[PDB]
Amino acid sequence: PFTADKGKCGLPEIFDPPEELERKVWELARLVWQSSSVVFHTGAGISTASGIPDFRGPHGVWTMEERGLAPKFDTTFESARPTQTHMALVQLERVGLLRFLVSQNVDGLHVRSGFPRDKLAELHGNMFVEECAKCKTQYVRDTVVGTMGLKATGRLCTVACRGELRDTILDWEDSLPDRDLALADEASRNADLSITLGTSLQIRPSGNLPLATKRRGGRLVIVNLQPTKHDRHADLRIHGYVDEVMTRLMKHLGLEIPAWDGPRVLERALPPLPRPPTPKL
Ligand SMILES: Nc1ncnc2c1ncn2[C@@H]1O[C@H](COP(=O)(O)OP(=O)(O)OC[C@H]2O[C@H](O)[C@H](O)[C@@H]2O)[C@@H](O)[C@H]1O
Ligand SMILES: Oc1cc(O)c2cc(O)c(-c3ccc(O)c(O)c3)[o+]c2c1
Ligand SMILES: [Zn+2]
């Protein structure tokens, strides 16, 4: 909170004009269609349309802190509903168009959305997830785990164990979880397309994973209202609200954004569902 360096905060928003936005979302369609392995990278900007403020946007947690004001929540973590973006990603995984999802978000919404945990990396941890120090068994709770920085929560392990239970929320000095970073890095190196949604890309190594896709000729799309640390490296930069982008993409792809049934946890990806045939490009 003092020692922490918060990167650049409160940069100006960019809006693509509506005909450029429409053109660019068609090109995002064309690239999704051309690709064999698609990885999505999400940050705090996908949850802003759910009432959860971001870090470095105009009213982000850190931006407001810099000006001596508070960020504002229009929801609790528990009562937050996944966005259209969240549900678009669920569907794109179910019809096999997303190989893997890498998220810096600690907000719990991917997991509560129904997104399979074996295709998700939560680089910064999950506020609803506690982990046994002894067996490493993870517990997805209906309520936020009351501590941050990999501290004792008060709860014991209930396996076959009685290990001390601790939060998954990284402090500034904490190493990223080895499993999640290992898988996110592998998915990012093998992708032929990395699509960044609602991240400023300013945190290392989280914000560098999409760069790994450009090695051996992969393409990079950044969707973001503000500039991001790697705009220069993008084949396609879309300045728009992620909900409007992802709903036009899904319409181009012939997909519906499915219903949210309330909080549900899926450990393992299901077999792939049908998807529409590909346009000639
Ligand atoms: N609806 C929206 N549509 C598109 N862009 C949006 C929207 N709302 C916000 N944005 C943009 O979304 C971007 C979000 O960027 P940042 O606030 O840096 O969040 P992170 O996920 O990268 O933070 C990384 C970590 O840093 C922290 O310390 C924690 O550890 C976090 O895990 C901004 O550029 C907004 O313009
Ligand atoms: O004012 C606070 C105090 C806290 O202890 C927080 C802990 C958090 O994990 C978050 C949080 C903030 C913004 C997000 O976009 C997010 O995913 C979590 O906010 C706090 C705010
Ligand atoms: Zn245990």
Q: Whose CA is nearest to atom 6 of ligand 1?
A: 45
Output phi, psi for 119, to 5 deg: -115, 10
The CATH code of domain 125-173 reads 2.20.28.200
Q: Which of 143, 112, 155 is nearest to 266 (CA)?
A: 112
Ligand nearest to the CA of 162: 3
Q: Which fold has domain 17-124+174-269?
A: Rossmann fold (3.40.50)
With a 6 A CB cut-off, is 61 part of the ligand 2 pocket? yes
Output phi, psi for 105, to 5 deg: -80, 135
Ligand nearest to the CA of 85: 1
Q: Whose CA is nearest to atom 35 of ligand 1?
A: 57
Distance 137 CA to ligand 2 centre (A): 25
Q: Whose CA is nearest to atom 19 of ligand 2?
A: 61
Tokens of residue 113, six digits = 């959305």
**Residues with active-site annotation:** 124
Provide the CA 261 distance to its chain's centre, in angstroms.
20
Q: Which helix (H) or strand (E) holds 165?
A: strand 164-167
Omega before 210 cis (within 30°)? no
CB-CB contact of 21 with 240 (8 Å): yes
C-alpha 155/C-alpha 181 separation (Å) is 26
C-alpha 27/C-alpha 21 separation (Å) is 10
Ligand 1 environment, Cβ below 6 A: 43-45, 48-49, 54-57, 60, 104, 124, 198-200, 202-203, 224-226, 241-242
Q: How was this structure determined?
A: X-ray
C-alpha 200/C-alpha 223 separation (Å) is 10
C-alpha 200/C-alpha 122 separation (Å) is 17
CB-CB contact of 155 with 165 (8 Å): yes
Q: Which of 55, 110, 54, 117 is nearest to 85 (CA)?
A: 110
Q: Is 215 exposed, middle or buried (0-12, 13-18, 19+ CB in 10 A)?
A: exposed
For residues 225, 53, 58, 181, the Cα torsion angle rounded to the nearest 10 degrees is -60
Ligand nearest to the CA of 167: 2
Under DSSP, the state recorded for 268 is S
Tell me the structure's resolution in angstroms, rounded to a single decimal: 2.1
CB-CB contact of 130 with 155 (8 Å): yes
- Where along the chain do the CATH 2.20.28.200 domains lie? 125-173
CB-CB contact of 94 with 270 (8 Å): yes
Please choose from 46, 54, 168 the residue to mutate so as to test ligand 1's pocket, defined by most ligand atoms within 8 A of CB: 54
Q: Which residue has the tokens 């601790």?
A: 166
| Annotated binding-site ranges for Zn(2+) | 132, 135, 157, 161
9: left (phi over 0), alpha (psi -120 to 50) or beta: beta
- Where along the chain do the CATH 3.40.50.1220 domains lie? 17-124+174-269
Ligand 1 atom nearest 13 alpha carbon = 36
CB-CB contact of 266 with 114 (8 Å): yes
CB-CB contact of 255 with 91 (8 Å): yes
C-alpha 121/C-alpha 109 separation (Å) is 13
